[PDB]
């Protein structure tokens, strides 16, 4: 069962999520919403019926080779993963679609950038993690470069990004530079340089050791 990896929609507008299969219109299709860390929850079943408790703006259709989950009047809280599902009686197995992430569209928002030197307690353990935080931005795409005494770093940082916020539709992102304490104390200036659509030019956050 083939679904688009991603669908984007503005608040109050209508999202349509497809579920493809050869003659899928001949069998019943059911739809689940899954929020991060949570179990899936059926939102449409038997092609177009709604479980009690589900808002009327969730509806479904199924015909030919395509089933469709429609979410009308989209809200920020509709950001989630959505899966279609059938029972395949030719192999006697439940089959899920590959899932669709719904992204809510909003205006561009520049990140608020913060840099964190390593703690003394970590340095005592012999390692230094330097953390750069990009807070509450949109869209998700951003570039973070690390510079140590103006020398560009590569291969020694990792990034993590939040799921889109269920209320304000922004993202946050961390980049963590990891050095040995021995290497860390050899340098003075630690800097995070951030590029994003909401910024006129790259923003740099830095500290001098001590």
């Amino acid at each position: 069962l083939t679904q688009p990896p991603s669908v984007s929609v503005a608040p109050g507008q209508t999202a349509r999520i497809t579920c493809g299969g050869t003659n899928i219109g001949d069998i019943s299709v059911h739809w689940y919403q899954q929020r991060p860390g949570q179990a899936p929850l059926v939102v449409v079943y038997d092609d177009s019926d709604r479980p009690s408790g589900i808002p009327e703006r969730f509806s479904g259709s199924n015909s030919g080779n395509t089933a469709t989950l429609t979410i009308s009047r989209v809200e920020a809280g509709d950001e989630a993963d959505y899966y279609c599902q059938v029972w395949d009686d030719s192999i006697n197995a439940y089959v899920f679609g590959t899932g669709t992430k719904v992204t809510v569209l909003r205006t561009v928002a520049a990140p608020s950038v913060f840099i964190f030197p390593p703690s003394d307690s970590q340095l005592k353990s012999g390692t230094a993690s330097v953390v750069c935080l990009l807070n509450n931005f949109y869209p998700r795409e951003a570039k973070v470069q690390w510079k140590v005494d103006n020398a560009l770093q590569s291969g020694n940082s990792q990034e993590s990004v939040t799921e889109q916020d269920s209320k304000d539709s922004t993202y946050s992102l961390s980049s963590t530079l990891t050095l040995s304490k021995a290497d860390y104390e050899k340098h003075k200036v630690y800097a995070c340089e951030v590029t994003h659509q909401g910024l006129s030019s790259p923003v740099t956050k830095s500290f001098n050791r001590g």
Binding site: A39, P40, A93, N135
Partner: protein, 218 residues
């Protein structure tokens, strides 16, 4: 309260066995077909197996045939999944799910919260917790905790025992080349609060029974 509760998840060495249990409450368990459904980290839902009310009929996906055995005890309102010869492809959150026979088909109308099964030779290890100290623009400051070098997933972080939730971002963990996990949790707060308000991150790593409270100050 209508509920499914899965237990038995944890770390299992490759090639070894593990039995999952699912306890139902709030409904007539013997009236329902029951399934196990799994989800590998970051990937899609995959149905695994199911069993009818009197346990005469069981179905499995090809990938787990023979290796996995689904069973049930209606007296104990319980579902079980025996998993033998486990591989890395079996690493997943495993959900118990109830099957509903609708007018035109079959779907899942009740799920548990799931239990994580990590197939690895790696040892369980609690995290080290480090402050991300504040030191600020426009009236807002950021602070946080770095939760470093643990295995396996998951870790939970709260702030001020759950009293602080606004402006909290707890990032998805990253797997380091060392094979250990690390994550950070941050929060933005009024910068004027830094002198007076105490901020403590509460880190729980249940697999290692590690509980850490770290005060984060300027």
């Amino acid at each position: 309260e209508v509920q499914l509760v899965e237990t038995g998840g944890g770390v299992v060495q490759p090639g070894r066995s593990l039995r999952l249990s699912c306890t139902a409450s709030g409904f007539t368990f013997r009236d329902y077909w029951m399934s196990w459904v799994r989800q590998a980290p970051g990937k899609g839902l995959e149905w695994v197996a199911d069993i009818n009310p009197d346990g005469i009929t069981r179905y499995y996906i090809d990938a787990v045939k023979g290796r996995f055995t689904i069973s049930r005890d209606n007296a104990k309102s319980s579902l079980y999944l025996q998993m033998n010869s486990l591989g890395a492809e079996d690493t997943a959150v495993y959900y118990c799910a109830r099957e509903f026979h609708s007018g035109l088909g079959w779907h899942f109308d009740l799920w548990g919260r799931g239990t994580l099964v990590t197939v690895s030779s790696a040892s369980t290890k609690g995290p080290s917790v480090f402050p991300l100290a504040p030191s600020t623009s426009g009236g807002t400051a950021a602070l946080g905790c770095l939760v470093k070098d643990y295995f396996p997933e998951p870790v939970t972080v709260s702030w001020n025992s759950g009293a602080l939730t606004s402006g909290v971002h707890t990032f998805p963990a990253v797997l380091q080349s060392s094979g250990l996990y690390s994550l950070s949790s941050v929060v933005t707060v009024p910068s004027s609060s830094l002198g007076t308000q105490t901020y403590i991150c509460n880190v729980n790593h249940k697999p290692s029974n590690t509980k850490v409270d770290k005060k984060v100050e300027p």
